[PDB]
Design a protein around this ligand. Structure first.
Ligand code: NA
Ligand code: NA
Length: 94
């Protein structure tokens, strides 16, 4: 778990392309993916698939997270994880 000070430090580096900072941010939020994924069960995708799609969002969330927008990383990551899951559920309809 990252302090606010640590999170902003890593976020500033991550925004500039620092992969170690991006890794630190993702590793601190791996649990968030499973927790969110569980909320989308029984919608046509099994849990492992929901985790996989959620993971896509968590990874995307460290590519351009700007602390200056005023939101904490776990918030921005939550939005992204929900979005990639919801996208995957949409894709079940062709
Ligand atoms: Na702090
Ligand atoms: Na926030």
């Amino acid at each position: 778990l990252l302090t606010a000070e640590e999170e902003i430090h890593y976020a500033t580096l991550a925004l500039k392309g620092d992969m170690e900072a991006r890794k630190k941010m993702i590793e601190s939020n791996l649990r968030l993916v499973v927790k969110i994924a569980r909320r989308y069960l029984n919608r046509g995708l099994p849990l492992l698939d929901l985790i996989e799609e959620g993971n896509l969002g968590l990874m995307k969330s460290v590519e351009k997270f700007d602390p200056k927008r005023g939101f904490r990383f776990s918030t921005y990551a939550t939005w992204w994880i929900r979005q990639t899951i919801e996208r995957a559920i949409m894709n079940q309809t062709r």
